[PDB]
């Protein structure tokens, strides 16, 4: 594709969306929405059979764009994105673990943040901590696309997929593919540990540039804008025991798009 | 509004203000002002009934501005400071102690945010638990919409404006990134039970309030809207293991300029 | 009313070390550079700390060279260094020990601040507890105003100037961001009971003191006002579990230039 | 070489992509513990320290042959690289057969981390250095003993302990450092964070370019039309629920190197 | 003071000087089986009986590198000095701390406990020895014979626990100036650039970055680097990574790592 000049003047639009987290309890009518079910630990490598509701997933949405049609395409220039609800973790009166008469123990542990903006679905590369996990039916996992062997514990280049279903691609089996995603920008960070404190910043003043080194943003070839994210804040522990749940937060996107002339 | 040129020459004014923390003991005559009451923890998810004095709140105020009329005061920049980190170096108070060591200082989860705008801060409701029973006299998501499990994620019906000091609990309200066109907000959160608090302080740092088009917040009705919350963690008195939130005050020095608008 | 800088003669460097005032403020005392052992109150109403158990601000007024529309010395920039982090690598002293391991080094809360100005640092009073009974011979909020629960937040009547070395406790006084027009201050705080101390040192970093208009602090009466505090945490001697504040000295090298004024 | 001007236009730029798999000790892709070490055993004495090859992490390396460009000569010059450590998301699996506290989650991978990558026009130069001069390294590895007499000097800088990274999965990280006194024609980057239970930290993106040009605007020159990639990415230790024995866990690294044709004398 | 004139240009106006400085952690003898470590640290039974053996404390490393001779004709109204423009410096051997199979402390069947605790990194490049300011945690320590400590240069009193401006020395001997008694002096070192960082704690994880792509500029605010007096380049460092604990007990040893320097120098004219 030949990328020609930007249009000027009617030539800009803003697309906003909130994506809700898909932490395992993905049903908005369930009392534990925004969390996983209680995590259970395998008795052996060969008996590792996690239920769908115990794992966190990627969130994704395709936003329809105004129709345009040289050819014109919407070009994503920049995004303001925000993870909403760190303030909710300041609740330490809920039914939580307690030391003596101290406050309820807040959400802590491993965190995983990523967002992406693109003109087509996010490209995913499969990879697993254990090749022996028996994933439940009704997900997309590396077994969905290739023969799973010990190679999946490193880089098996046959384990390719696209993020095309909200709440069904587990984060534990799928990474953004750095060998593809020519038409997507993705950003993420991971911080491990069992009891690590979570960290978040929030503002409406920070713009993420989506232009590549040539000044070109993602091009929305199909009249669709693709938003993807995951925002795991750590584990919650209810006062009913020592079982833990993943806790995730929603993410806002406000994407600025401009009309770009193109030729095949 | 079509924004026109800035004025030059009496064209600039500074607004100086502070907001005291609203940590639950919000009465300046109470011996525990600047703290919450002792935090109690629910016996069940269905019996979670926190008293108003045990939770921290947003602070807010509207500063009246010189009447201009059109002209609007435009907020260009702010110097803001959280005052009092020095006070946490008191380890001789009636505090928990290991053997004959110092008093255990304030530690735990921190929540810092400030906002400067030309109208009240837009809030989005969100909660850790949809089953919490909030006390009478507060503004919570239940004040504006039916509260269901959707409130644990993003329920777009849970919209409010920060329009009362010490009444909007931080645990139920986020700054709304989908609104606040006429406000700049900034914040950071760090969790954990015993995490060390961190603060910087200086009079040399200016926060720019101009947007990408070089336009600051425009003060509707000649009012400047300031908002904040500065939770430093929990204090533990030597009388037991019960903990209290501890907050600190925030200073604002806002530079405003006159901006013509259509 | 600030006019043009002079050129050519027209620059001077002023150097000083300020020794820490950690409570043992007497350079002939064997515990100089430390506090006395910290005792913890038995009750909120019986909190009576001896002067030697609390850290203080350090300060000095450095007389300046002759230079006389008048001229004033304008502070352009400073190189400042906390000296002695290397001393904390001593783990063979009479210290707490785990089995046959090293002596437990200084850890805990840190408070660093420095200021350079043309008049004394303006201080705002604020306290963790309004009920502390401060000893005689200090300057505390009680020295300037009625102490009430308001002092746990911002009581704007609690104003003072840092005009005595080793007498203004850090636990009752913050640099005042509503004043200090003619001073630049910088500080950071990191809490916790056993947090590791962190320090950088170099002779290659210059702190600029010029404001947004290119004007540095102007030295009234030809005096340069330096202020600091550098608490590194607590030391624990092998004689028990009682702890002492440990502080380090700070070096300043301020570049001044001659400035014409009305 | 006298370095002359860059070439311009159609065909003057090429991109080389590769994934390098980690060599954590279990280096066989058919083994059920691929991407991990074998269970780490600790010496009973300084003089009985005999680690099996499968219990130690290694440098990964590959030489990628480049397009034909000659018939002044031209060399491919590495300008920049996008590199990514893949798979931090896999550490969010806390349901596997792992240690747990009461009914809490499986204890995830934690501990010491070692990240390094290098891009060059010849093999990475290595400097030998060891925690203990008394370790008895197993047959089939390349260690300082391979190139010099090992003495207590190896616990500091013994300048006789020089080697080139010329074999994947055979140079243990615990005996070899990138040599800052050589590597004129390679750029290397790394970070280390120690501790027994330290949380691992990783960022990932496709928007960050690492510039490989030196102070004179010259990148690594592929003197033999080969691009040399090297790395190690230790994430910490994994603990299986079968015991308290630990395994190193590593992750693969992606490289996408931009090269341009450079005239040389 | 040296009156600085123009930089020279062209062939042979530039040279690069490289060196490795080995750490001096207490076991300073390269033939000793614990080279690069301290002897096992012992803790005083009282403030008045604090008598540390010289092998139990880390020291500053230093070297003077000879430079090409510049000034054979001392009648000239202008002379030349080597000016240090920049340095690439690297602490080598963080990878060695990934050895957790050595004879080390262990929890159950877990890995050997690696080096952790307080870190102290510093390096300096100058045209004369690094200026040192004495300062101590305790004025009562009895230092062993054959070291240079504040007592070597002044009367040691409680003042030494803060800033005693009489405690001045120059870093002129490798492995003899303990880090616990000497700081780089910010009131001198006009002709040296120094850089350091300290992180405390008993079990803090050590942190290190390494690369060959980072240049440290040595030019001052006037564009002038250190000027090499007597055609000597002075390098100084210390790189304590924490404490090692052998499986023979709970006694701990300091562990240090070597540092590389590659200094770019240029000829600078000065008034004679």
Author numbering:
A (entry chain AAA): 29 to 37, 39 to 98, 105 to 299
B (entry chain BBB): 29 to 37, 39 to 98, 106 to 298
C (entry chain CCC): 30 to 37, 39 to 98, 105 to 298
D (entry chain EEE): 29 to 99, 105 to 298
E (entry chain DDD): 28 to 299
The authors write:
Polyomaviruses are small double-stranded DNA (dsDNA) viruses with a circular genome of approximately 5,000 bp. All glycan-binding polyomaviruses analyzed to date engage oligosaccharide (glycan) structures featuring terminal sialic acids that in mammals are usually presented either on gangliosides, which are molecules composed of a glycosphingolipid, i.e., a ceramide and an oligosaccharide, or on glycoproteins, which contain mostly complex and branched oligosaccharides attached to amino acids during co- and posttranslational modification steps. These sialylated glycan structures interact with loop regions at the outer margin of the major capsid protein VP1, at the apical surface of the polyomavirus capsid, as revealed by X-ray crystallography and cryoelectron microscopy. The VP1 surface exhibits an astonishing plasticity, providing virus-specific interactions for a range of Neu5Ac linkage types and further specific characteristics of Neu5Ac-containing glycans.
